[PDB]
């Protein structure tokens, strides 16, 4: 801490995991149609 700061990312890790889970479920149930 000498005048320098670190800002947190807007998306937390839980949300990123949720996106990955949604993508995986979509591709595992609907094929490529959901794209």
């Amino acid at each position: 801490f000498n005048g320098l700061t670190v800002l947190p990312p807007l998306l937390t890790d839980e949300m990123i995991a949720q996106y990955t889970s949604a993508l995986l479920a979509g591709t595992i149930t609907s094929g490529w149609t959901f794209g």
Partner: protein, 50 residues
Amino acid sequence: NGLTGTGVLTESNKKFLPFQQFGRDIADTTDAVRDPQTLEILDITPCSFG
């Protein structure tokens, strides 16, 4: 004792070896001191900003 700086001081649980006077961690920034009267280790943190 001649070492000057601004911040907020709290109690600390570090254990100085009986001859050091202060401490630094990385890039040579002082973090702890020893008051020459009570002979206890105090911890320094910068005043808040943003």
